Write a protein that binds this ligand. Structure first.
Ligand SMILES: *[C@@H]1O[C@H](CO)[C@@H](O[C@@H]2O[C@H](CO)[C@@H](O[C@@H]3O[C@H](CO)[C@@H](O)[C@H](O)[C@@H]3O)[C@H](O)[C@H]2NC(C)=O)[C@H](O)[C@H]1NC(C)=O
Ligand SMILES: *[C@@H]1O[C@H](CO)[C@@H](O[C@@H]2O[C@H](CO)[C@@H](O)[C@H](O)[C@H]2NC(C)=O)[C@H](O)[C@H]1NC(C)=O
Ligand SMILES: *[C@@H]1O[C@H](CO)[C@@H](O)[C@H](O)[C@H]1NC(C)=O
Ligand SMILES: *[C@@H]1O[C@H](CO)[C@@H](O)[C@H](O)[C@H]1NC(C)=O
Ligand SMILES: *[C@@H]1O[C@H](CO)[C@@H](O)[C@H](O)[C@H]1NC(C)=O
Lengths: 570, 485, 154, 291
C-alpha cells in the first residue's frame, strides 16, 4: 500500500462514540515516534527498540473528524477517526399538499447534527393498499428537513385515514419516530384562483363583476378588497360562486386592491394562499350635487351693466372625476332671453342690460355627461332697509376661526328663507341657525369685510361690516402730510397708510397736539376710522404760538407708535 | 597607564579577536602580547600602532584549554606590562547584529522591528534611539521568543533614528560574551506629515470648455540628523497626486495617478484632487481639494423628444465614430437616482426619472479612451424642464396693490421655471376691462417679479391674469384677480 | 486536433494540483516520495524521443508528414499507460465518496479529458495518500506526454 | 578515523570545552622495528618513542603532518586531518549558503547532460575541492566530470562581497530517456589548512533550468509595433520537443508565447524574459531594447 514505513492500528473501532477511549499502536517493518492530532485538518494538538512497537492511549476526542498520524521527519502511517452520536427520534412531523395537482410533500425535525453521514426514510401507508417509501441522505452540507415523495394520490377519495413514518439510520444507532396518524382532509391546500378579471356593468363605478377560474368542485371562496383610504381590508365570503361574482355598492373613482382565496369544502380541505393582487381603477360616476353660483353687480351703465359669475367646487360629490367642461346658461325672467357659453375656469363675465331679473345656471360636465343644472335666482344687490338686520357682530376666539352672529331683521324673520354670506368667497346659512361658523380661506393680520344678503324673490336685504380674526399693535402710523388753515379751522390731510404695518383692521386714530413749551399732557382728539375719509378738521388754537402735532393709530389689541411730527405757527 | 582592559573574544566561527585600550603617548610605542600553554610552550604577537589583532584556529593558539594572555608595551628604554589573564576561548563569544534591512511595521504608538538571525539561540536585545536635537537614549527590549526576533518601540511624532544590538546570554540566565556592536542606524519617519498649502492656478475656460492644470512643485523639509541618509526616513520618497472625474461614471471608475508637478488637461466638471506622499509605510497624509463644476456661457442647440416608451434626444455632434456619454441628472433633487448612458441622437426606454417637472442637467462628454482625463470634453451640460410646462408656467398668488389713481402695482411669486436658468423668456400680463372693448398685453423680463400697470380708466372694474413663458410654448393663464378703485 | 485537448488536460491538472496543494497542507502532498507504478513497461521513456535525438538503435492525430515506424510504439505505450491511469482514478474517485469526508472534491477534468484522448487516438486514510502520490508522478508523466505529442504533431 | 587518501588519515573530535578527545594509534610503514623519531610541524621535538605511538587528538594543534625519521633519513610521513562536530550537528564552515539557504547552487543550460555548480567560500588560503557522484546503487545516474576550483566574479550578499567557486560538470548516459526517474546526487569534499568537510546534495536537472535570453531583437513598427526575438542557439535540439515561454515587461505584466506581440510604448523600455512553458523553473536575465 502507501504505508511502507510500518503500520498503525486503533482499538476498538475507527468509528467511536463520544467520550470513549482509544488504544493506538504504531509499528515499523524491521530493518522519534511522534503522534500528531488534528481537528478538521487543523493543528491545535501536538506531542529504537521502544519505537519498534509503540502503544499509547488517546481520550477526550472532540466532536467531529480527527486526523491522528504516527510520524517518525518522515511519516510512518495514520488513520482518520470520526466521532458522533446516534440520530435523535424526529419530532414535529408536518406534511403538506398543494391543490388538486400536487404530490405529497412533508417536513420533519432531524434535531441536532451528528457530524456524520446519515440517511432518512419516509414511509406512507393507508387504506385500499396505498404505500410509498423514499430516502434522503444527510451530511455536513445537505440537510433533510423536507422531502417530496413524488406520488400524487387521488384527492377525491377523502375517506381514508393514513399513517406517516420517518426513520433514521446511521453507523452507530438506528432511530425512528411514532407512526403518526393523519386525516386525508387536513393535508390538501387548494391553489388560489387565477384569471381574476374585472367587467364593468351598469355604467357606474358602484357596480361591477368579478370573474375567475378555479377547481369546479370548490364550494367556498373568500374575497379581500380594499382601497388606500384605510388599512383594513374588506372581507366577503361566498358559497358556490362558481367562478363569478357581482359586486354592488362600491365607492366610485378609487384605486382598489383585490385578492381571492379558495376553500374546497366546509369540513374538508383547507384554506388557500392569497392570489395575485389586482390593482384596479374605479370609473367615474356622474354627480348629483348642487353647486351654488355667486355674482357681483357692478354698474358700468344702465343699459350695459356687467354681471360676474363665480363658483367653486371643493368636494368629490359635485366635483367628482375629471371635470373639464362648464356649460353656463343665463335666463332673463321678465322677458324670454337666454345665453349659453362654455367655460373651463371658475370666473366668467358678461354684459347685460340692467332691466329685468335673472336666473343663472351652470352644469358640471365630466367624462360620462353633465350633472344636474344648478340654478340661482338673481335679484338686486341691495333692497330696502326695512329687511336690513341690526348691525352684524363677529367674534374670533381662535386664530383660524370666526363666528358671525346676526340679529333678526326689524320687521320679521319669516319672509326670508335663506341667507348667503360672502367675504370674495361664499357660504350659505339657514335662517333657523343663529350664527355661522366660518374657518376657511381666511388669513389673520389682514382686514376683511363680511357681508350677508337675505335672499328674497322680490327685494333682498343687504348688510356688511369690517373686521378681522386676529390683530396686534400696528407697526407704524401714517404721516401728517398737509396742514391748512381756513374759516378758523385747521384741516389735516394724509395719505393711505400701506397695508402690512397695521397687521389687521385699524380701529381708530388718536391725534395729540400741544404747544412747544408745555411738558404736560398733550391735548387729544379722537377720530373713528373710516375708509372714505382722508382729511380731518380741528378747531382754532392759540394765535401767535407754535404748536406740535402728532398722531397714533390705535386698535383693540394694540397701538401704533408715534409717527411723524409737525410744527405749525399760525 | 599603559595597556588596560584586555579582552579577547570570538568574532565568528573559525575566528577570534582581542583588544584593549592604551593610556599614554602614541609616539614610538610598541605593543606585544603573549599566550602560554600548560601541556610549557608559549606564542606571541604584535601589530604596532594598530589595535585590532586577528587570530583564528589555524595559527597554533590553544583553544580547548585555559589559555593565558599577558601584554607588554615598549617605548624608549622602558617596558611595562598589564595584568595576566587565563580563560577558555570558545565562551564569551561576540554575536552578530541583525544583518540586512530589518523589517519595520507601524501602529498607533507602536513600532515593530522584526529581523532574522543566523544563530538560532536567543540573545539579549538592546537598542538606542536618538532625537535630531538630543543625544542617544538607551532601552532594553526585554525577553522574546524564537527563526526571527522582534522588538517594540513607542512611536515618536517626528522622525527619529535607532540602532539595535545584542549579546549572547548563557542558558543559565547569565550574560556570556559581551555586547555585540550596534548595526547600521535605521530612521523612522513621522507617522503623520504636517502638510502646508500648495498653490494652484485658476483661470476661465476657453470656448471649447477646457482648462489647464500645472501643479506647483514644492516639498516639505524634515529635520533629520547627520546619519539619517539613504533612506526615506530623511525625506519623503515621492510626492503624488490623484485626480477623480466624478461626472461621467457610466464606464468603469477612472481615477488617475500623476507625479506631482506636470501639465494636465482638465474639463469644466467637478473633480477631486488628492495630494499624497508615499513614505516607507505608504500613504501618510492627504491634501484634499474639490473642483466645482461649471458651464460655458455659449449655449449650443439641443433637441428633445419625450413621451411614450421611447425618449430620444438629438443634436449635431462635431464628429461621429467616437463613443459619447450622456448624463441626465436631476438638479434640485438629492441625486438619489443617477442616470447616464454610453453610446446625432440617443434613444432609451422611458422611466419615471426624467419625465417630472424640475431641472435636468444633460451632460455630453466626448471620449475615446476611458483611462486619461485629457480627452473628456464638456460639450454641453444644459438645463431641461420635463413634462407639461404650462402648469408650472402658471403664476401663483397674484397680488395687485393700488399705487396712485392711474398706476397700480402687480406682483407675483417666482414659479418653478424661474429656478431653472435659461428657459424662461418673458411674462405675458393681460389688462382687459370688463366691457371687453379695451384689451392689452405687456411683456415682462423674467428677472422682474413686479410690474406697474398704467393707462387705466377710473371707476372701471378690472380683471388681471398673469402667465410665465418659456422659449418653446406659452404658459397657462393664472386665476384672475378682480380689483378696482 | 488532440492538441487542444492536451492543453485543456494540462490546465485542469494544474488546477487540481494547486487545489490539492492548498487544501492538503499536512497530507503527503509536498518529501516528494516519488515512486512510479509504470516500472513494468517503460517504452514511454524509451520510444518517445526525436529521430535526431536517436543515436543508438540498441535502446489518429499522427500527421502524414511526420511518419515513423517507432513513434507508434510511443503512442501505444501512452495509450496503455493512460488506460491503467484511468482505471485507478475510477477507483480513487469511487473511494473518495463512500465515506462522509467531502472536504476535497475531484472534478471530472482529467477524467473526461483522457476519455476524449482515448476515443480520439484509437477506436479510509490510505486512499488520499495514494491519490497524492499518483498525482505527483502523474504531473511529470503528463508533461512527458505533452512534450512528445507536441513534437510529433508539429 | 579513516583513510581519506593513501597515507592520509582523518578523524573526528568532540569540539567541546569539557570532554576529552579521541585516541588514535599511529605506526610507521617500515619493516625495521626500533625506536624512531616522529616529529610534527606545530610541535618541535619528538613527542613519542617507538614504532607504535598513541595520540589523543582534541584540538587542531594535534592535526597536520607527522614525519617518521631516523638519523638523517625520512622513513615515512603521515597526514592527519580533522572533521569537526557541534553537538550532533555537523560543522559546515568552509562554505556559505546562497540567498535561498542553500549551500550548493547548480544550474543546467539545456538537456545536454551538462551543467555547472556554484558555491561561496570565505577565504582562499590553501583550499582543496573534490566533486564526486556519491553513488550507492549501481543503476544510479553517474557523472564523469573533472574538477575546477576556478575563481569567478566576486559576488556580494547583505554584507561584504565574497568569493564564488564553481565547477562545470557533465552527466553521461548510455541511452537517452524521455524523462528522468532517479535524481542526481553530488558529494563535495573540502579542505582548509587540514579542516576536512563533506557536503552533500540531491536535485533533478529538470527543476533547475535557467535558459538564455534571446539573441536577435528586431523592431518593426506595423499603425502598430511588433518586437521580434528568437530562441537562443544555446538550447536543446529541436526547439519543438523542448519549448520556451516569455514574459513581457514595460518600464507586473503579461506572458506571451508567440514571437510578435503588438504592444505600444509609453516612453519606457520593454523587455522579455525566458522561461520553460511547463515547469516553474528559474527565470533568466532580460536582454532587451527600448521600444
Ligand atoms: C398640458 O396639459 C393640458 C391639459 O389637458 C393639455 O391639453 C390642453 O388642454 C386645455 C384644456 O383647457 C386646452 O385649452 C383649450 O384651448 C382652446 C383654445 O382655443 C379653447 O378653445 C378650449 O376651450 C380649451 O380652453 C389646451 O389647448 C390644451 N393644449 C394643447 C397643446 O392642446 C396640454 O396638451 C398639455 N401640454 C403638454 C405640452 O403636454
Ligand atoms: C561524508 O561525511 C560523513 C560525515 O561527515 C563521513 O562519514 C564517515 O565515514 C567514514 C567512512 O567513510 C566512517 O568511518 C565514519 O565513522 C563516518 N563518520 C561518522 C561520524 O560515523 C563520510 O565518510 C563522508 N564521505 C562520504 C563519501 O560519505
Ligand atoms: C436497530 O437497532 C437494533 C439495536 O439497537 C438492532 O437489533 C436492529 O437490528 C436494528 N434494525 C435495523 C433495521 O437496523
Ligand atoms: C566556558 O566553558 C568552560 C568549560 O570548562 C567553563 O569553565 C567556562 O567557565 C565557560 N566560560 C568562560 C568564562 O570561559
Ligand atoms: C526572515 O525570513 C523569512 C523567510 O520566509 C522572510 O519571509 C522574512 O521576511 C525574513 N525577515 C524577517 C522576519 O524580518
Amino acid at each position: 500500500d502507501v504505508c511502507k514505513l510500518g503500520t498503525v492500528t486503533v482499538q476498538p473501532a475507527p468509528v467511536i462514540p463520544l467520550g470513549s477511549a482509544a488504544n493506538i499502536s504504531c509499528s515499523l517493518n524491521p530493518k522519534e515516534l511522534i503522534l500528531l492530532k488534528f481537528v478538521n485538518d487543523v493543528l491545535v494538538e501536538n506531542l529504537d527498540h521502544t519505537g519498534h512497537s509503540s502503544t499509547f492511549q488517546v481520550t477526550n476526542l472532540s466532536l467531529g473528524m480527527t486526523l491522528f498520524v504516527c510520524k517518525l521527519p518522515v511519516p510512518v502511517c495514520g488513520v482518520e477517526i470520526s466521532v458522533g452520536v446516534a440520530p435523535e427520534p424526529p419530532q414535529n412531523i408536518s406534511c403538506v399538499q398543494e391543490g388538486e395537482n400536487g404530490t405529497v410533500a412533508c417536513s420533519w425535525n432531524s434535531g441536532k447534527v451528528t457530524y456524520l453521514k446519515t440517511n432518512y426514510t419516509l414511509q406512507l401507508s393507508g387504506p385500499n393498499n396505498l404505500t410509498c417509501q423514499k430516502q434522503c441522505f444527510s451530511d455536513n452540507r445537505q440537510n433533510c428537513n423536507r422531502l417530496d415523495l413524488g406520488i400524487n394520490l387521488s384527492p377525491d377519495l377523502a375517506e381514508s385515514r393514513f399513517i406517516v413514518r420517518v426513520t433514521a439510520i446511521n453507523d452507530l444507532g438506528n432511530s425512528s419516530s411514532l407512526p403518526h396518524t393523519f386525516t386525508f382532509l387536513d393535508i390538501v391546500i387548494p391553489l388560489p384562483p387565477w384569471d381574476i378579471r374585472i367587467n364593468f356593468l351598469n355604467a357606474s363605478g358602484s357596480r361591477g363583476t368579478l370573474q375567475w377560474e378555479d377547481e369546479g368542485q370548490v364550494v367556498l371562496n373568500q374575497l379581500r378588497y380594499q382601497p388606500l383610504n384605510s388599512t383594513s381590508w374588506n372581507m366577503v365570503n361566498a358559497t358556490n360562486a362558481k367562478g363569478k361574482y357581482d359586486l354592488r355598492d362600491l365607492r366610485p373613482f378609487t384605486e382598489y386592491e383585490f385578492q381571492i382565496s379558495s376553500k374546497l369544502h366546509l369540513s374538508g380541505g383547507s384554506w388557500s394562499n392569497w392570489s395575485e393582487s389586482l390593482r384596479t381603477r374605479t370609473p367615474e360616476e356622474e354627480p348629483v350635487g348642487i353647486l351654488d353660483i355667486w355674482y357681483m353687480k357692478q354698474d358700468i351703465d344702465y343699459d350695459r351693466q356687467q354681471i360676474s359669475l363665480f363658483w367653486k367646487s371643493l368636494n368629490p360629490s359635485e366635483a367628482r372625476g375629471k371635470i373639464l367642461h362648464y356649460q353656463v346658461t343665463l335666463q332673463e325672467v321678465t322677458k324670454k332671453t337666454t345665453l349659453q357659453n362654455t367655460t373651463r375656469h371658475t370666473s366668467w363675465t358678461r354684459v347685460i342690460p340692467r332691466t329685468g331679473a335673472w336666473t343663472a345656471s351652470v352644469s358640471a360636465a365630466n367624462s360620462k355627461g353633465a350633472s344636474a343644472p344648478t340654478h340661482i335666482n338673481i335679484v338686486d344687490l341691495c333692497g330696502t332697509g326695512l329687511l336690513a338686520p341690526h348691525q352684524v357682530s363677529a367674534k374670533s376666539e381662535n386664530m383660524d376661526n370666526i363666528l358671525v352672529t346676526w340679529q333678526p331683521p326689524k320687521k320679521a324673520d319669516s319672509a326670508v328663507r335663506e341667507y348667503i354670506v360672502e367675504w370674495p368667497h361664499w357660504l350659505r346659512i339657514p335662517p333657523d341657525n343663529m350664527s355661522a361658523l366660518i374657518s376657511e380661506n381666511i388669513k389673520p393680520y389682514i382686514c376683511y369685510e363680511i357681508r350677508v344678503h337675505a335672499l328674497s324673490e322680490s327685494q333682498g336685504g343687504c348688510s356688511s361690516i369690517r373686521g378681522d380674526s386676529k390683530h396686534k399693535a400696528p407697526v407704524s402710523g401714517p404721516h401728517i402730510t398737509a396742514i391748512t388753515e381756513k374759516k378758523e379751522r385747521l384741516f389735516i390731510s394724509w395719505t393711505h397708510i400701506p397695508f402690512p404695518e397695521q397687521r389687521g383692521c385699524i380701529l381708530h386714530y388718536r391725534i395729540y397736539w400741544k404747544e412747544r413749551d408745555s411738558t404736560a399732557q398733550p391735548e387729544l382728539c379722537e377720530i373713528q376710522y373710516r375708509r372714505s375719509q382722508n382729511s380731518h378738521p380741528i378747531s382754532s388754537l392759540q394765535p401767535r404760538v407754535t404748536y406740535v402735532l402728532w398722531m397714533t393709530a390705535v386698535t383693540a389689541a394694540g397701538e401704533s407708535p408715534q409717527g411723524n411730527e409737525r410744527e405749525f405757527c399760525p | 597607564l599603559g595597556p588596560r582592559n584586555l579582552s579577547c573574544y570570538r568574532v565568528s566561527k573559525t575566528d577570534y579577536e582581542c583588544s584593549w585600550q592604551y593610556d599614554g603617548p602614541e609616539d614610538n610605542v610598541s605593543h606585544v602580547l603573549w599566550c602560554c600553554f600548560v601541556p610549557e610552550r608559549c606564542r606571541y604577537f604584535s601589530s604596532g600602532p594598530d589595535r585590532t589583532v586577528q587570530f583564528w584556529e589555524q595559527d597554533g593558539i590553544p583553544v580547548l584549554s585555559k589559555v593565558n594572555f599577558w601584554v607588554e608595551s615598549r617605548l624608549g628604554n622602558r617596558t611595562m606590562k598589564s595584568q595576566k589573564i587565563s580563560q577558555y576561548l570558545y565562551n564569551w563569544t561576540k554575536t552578530t547584529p541583525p544583518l540586512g534591512h530589518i523589517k519595520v511595521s507601524q501602529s498607533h504608538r507602536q513600532l515593530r522591528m522584526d529581523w532574522n538571525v543566523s544563530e538560532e539561540a536567543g540573545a539579549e536585545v538592546q537598542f538606542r534611539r536618538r532625537m535630531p536635537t538630543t543625544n542617544w537614549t538607551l532601552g532594553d527590549c526585554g525577553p522574546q521568543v524564537n527563526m526571527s526576533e522582534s522588538c517594540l518601540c513607542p512611536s515618536e511624532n517626528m522622525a527619529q533614528e535607532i540602532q539595535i544590538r545584542r549579546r549572547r546570554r548563557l542558558s543559565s540566565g547569565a550574560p556570556g560574551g559581551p555586547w555585540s556592536d550596534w548595526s547600521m542606524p535605521v530612521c523612522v519617519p513621522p507617522e503623520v506629515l504636517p502638510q502646508a498649502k500648495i498653490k494652484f492656478l485658476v483661470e476661465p475656460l476657453n470656448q471649447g470648455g477646457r482648462r489647464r492644470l500645472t501643479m506647483q512643485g514644492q516639498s516639505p523639509q524634515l529635520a533629520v540628523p547627520e546619519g539619517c541618509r539613504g533612506r526615506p526616513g530623511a525625506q519623503v520618497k515621492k510626492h503624488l497626486v490623484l485626480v477623480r472625474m466624478l461626472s461621467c461614471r457610466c464606464q468603469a471608475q477612472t481615477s488617475k495617478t500623476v507625479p506631482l508637478g506636470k501639465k494636465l488637461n482638465l474639463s469644466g466638471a467637478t473633480y477631486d484632487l488628492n495630494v499624497l506622499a508615499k513614505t516607507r509605510f505608504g500613504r501618510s497624509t492627504i491634501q484634499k481639494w474639490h473642483l466645482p463644476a461649471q458651464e460655458l456661457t455659449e449655449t449650443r442647440a439641443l433637441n428633445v423628444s419625450v413621451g411614450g416608451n421611447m425618449t430620444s434626444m438629438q443634436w449635431a455632434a462635431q464628429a461621429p465614430g467616437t463613443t459619447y456619454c450622456l448624463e441626465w441628472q436631476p438638479w434640485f433633487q438629492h441625486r438619489n437616482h443617477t442616470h447616464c448612458t454610453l453610446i446625432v441622437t440617443h434613444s432609451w426606454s422611458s422611466k419615471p426619472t426624467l419625465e417630472q417637472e424640475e431641472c435636468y442637467r444633460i451632460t455630453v462628454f466626448a471620449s475615446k479612451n476611458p483611462k486619461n482625463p485629457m480627452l473628456w470634453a464638456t460639450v454641453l451640460s444644459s438645463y431641461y424642464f420635463g413634462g407639461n410646462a404650462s402648469r408650472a408656467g402658471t403664476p401663483r398668488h397674484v397680488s395687485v396693490r393700488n399705487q396712485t389713481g392711474d398706476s397700480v402695482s402687480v406682483e407675483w411669486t417666482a414659479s418653478q421655471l424661474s429656478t431653472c436658468p435659461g428657459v424662461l423668456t418673458q411674462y405675458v400680463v393681460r389688462c382687459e376691462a370688463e366691457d371687453g372693448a379695451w384689451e392689452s398685453e405687456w411683456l415682462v423680463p423674467p428677472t422682474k417679479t413686479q410690474v406697474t400697470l398704467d393707462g387705466l380708466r377710473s371707476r372701471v372694474m378690472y380683471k388681471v391674469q398673469v402667465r410665465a413663458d418659456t422659449a418653446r410654448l406659452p404658459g397657462a393663464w393664472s386665476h384672475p384677480q378682480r380689483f378696482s378703485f | 486536433r488532440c492538441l487542444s485537448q492536451s492543453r485543456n488536460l494540462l490546465k485542469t491538472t494544474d488546477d487540481m494540483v494547486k487545489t490539492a496543494r492548498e487544501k492538503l497542507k499536512h497530507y503527503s502532498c509536498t518529501d516528494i516520495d516519488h515512486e512510479d507504478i509504470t516500472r513494468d513497461q517503460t517504452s514511454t521513456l524509451k520510444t518517445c524521443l526525436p529521430l535526431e535525438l536517436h543515436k543508438n538503435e540498441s535502446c489518429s492525430c499522427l500527421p502524414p508528414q511526420k511518419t515513423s515506424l517507432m513513434m507508434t510504439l510511443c503512442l501505444g505505450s501512452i495509450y496503455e499507460d493512460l488506460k491503467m491511469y484511468q482505471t485507478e482514478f475510477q477507483a480513487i474517485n469511487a473511494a473518495l465518496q463512500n465515506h462522509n469526508h467531502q472536504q476535497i472534491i475531484l472534478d471530472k477534468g482529467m477524467l473526461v479529458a483522457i476519455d476524449e484522448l482515448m476515443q480520439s487516438l484509437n477506436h479510509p486514510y490510505r486512499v488520499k495518500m495514494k491519490l497524492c502520490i499518483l498525482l505527483h508522478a502523474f504531473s511529470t508523466r503528463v508533461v512527458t506526454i505533452n512534450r512528445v505529442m507536441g513534437y510529433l504533431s508539429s | 578515523m579513516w583513510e581519506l587518501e593513501k597515507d592520509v588519515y582523518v578523524v573526528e573530535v568532540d569540539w567541546t570545552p569539557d570532554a576529552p578527545g579521541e585516541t588514535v594509534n599511529l605506526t610507521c610503514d617500515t619493516p625495521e622495528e626500533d625506536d624512531i623519531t616522529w616529529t610534527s610541524d606545530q610541535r618541535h621535538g619528538v613527542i613519542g618513542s617507538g614504532k607504535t605511538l598513541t595520540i589523543t587528538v582534541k584540538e587542531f594543534l594535534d592535526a597536520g603532518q607527522y614525519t617518521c625519521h631516523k638519523g638523517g633519513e625520512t622513513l615515512s610521513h603521515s597526514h592527519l586531518l580533522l572533521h569537526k562536530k557541534e553537538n550532533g550537528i555537523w560543522s559546515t564552515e568552509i562554505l556559505k549558503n546562497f540567498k535561498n539557504k542553500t549551500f550548493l547552487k547548480c544550474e543546467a543550460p539545456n538537456y545536454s547532460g551538462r551543467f555547472t555548480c556554484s558555491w561561496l567560500v570565505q577565504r582562499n588560503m590553501d583550499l582543496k575541492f573534490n566533486i564526486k557522484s556519491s553513488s550507492s546503487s549501481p543503476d544510479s545516474r553517474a557523472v564523469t566530470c573533472g574538477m575546477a576550483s576556478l575563481s569567478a566574479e566576486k559576488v556580494t550578499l547583505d554584507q561584504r562581497d565574497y568569493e564564488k567557486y564553481s565547477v562545470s560538470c557533465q552527466e553521461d548516459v548510455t541511452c537517452p530517456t524521455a524523462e528522468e526517474t532517479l535524481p542526481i546526487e553530488l558529494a563535495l569534499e573540502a579542505r582548509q589548512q587540514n579542516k576536512y568537510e563533506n557536503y552533500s546534495t540531491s536535485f533533478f536537472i529538470r527543476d533547475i533550468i535557467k535558459p538564455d535570453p534571446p539573441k536577435n531583437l528586431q523592431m518593426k513598427p506595423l499603425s502598430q509595433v511588433e518586437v521580434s526575438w528568437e530562441y537562443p542557439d544555446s538550447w536543446s535540439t529541436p526547439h519543438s520537443y523542448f519549448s520556451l515561454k516569455f514574459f513581457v515587461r514595460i518600464q507586473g505584466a503579461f506572458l506571451v508565447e508567440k514571437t510578435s506581440t503588438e504592444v505600444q510604448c509609453k516612453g519606457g523600455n520593454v523587455c522579455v524574459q525566458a522561461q520553460d512553458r511547463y515547469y516553474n523553473s528559474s527565470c533568466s536575465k532580460w536582454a532587451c531594447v527600448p521600444c
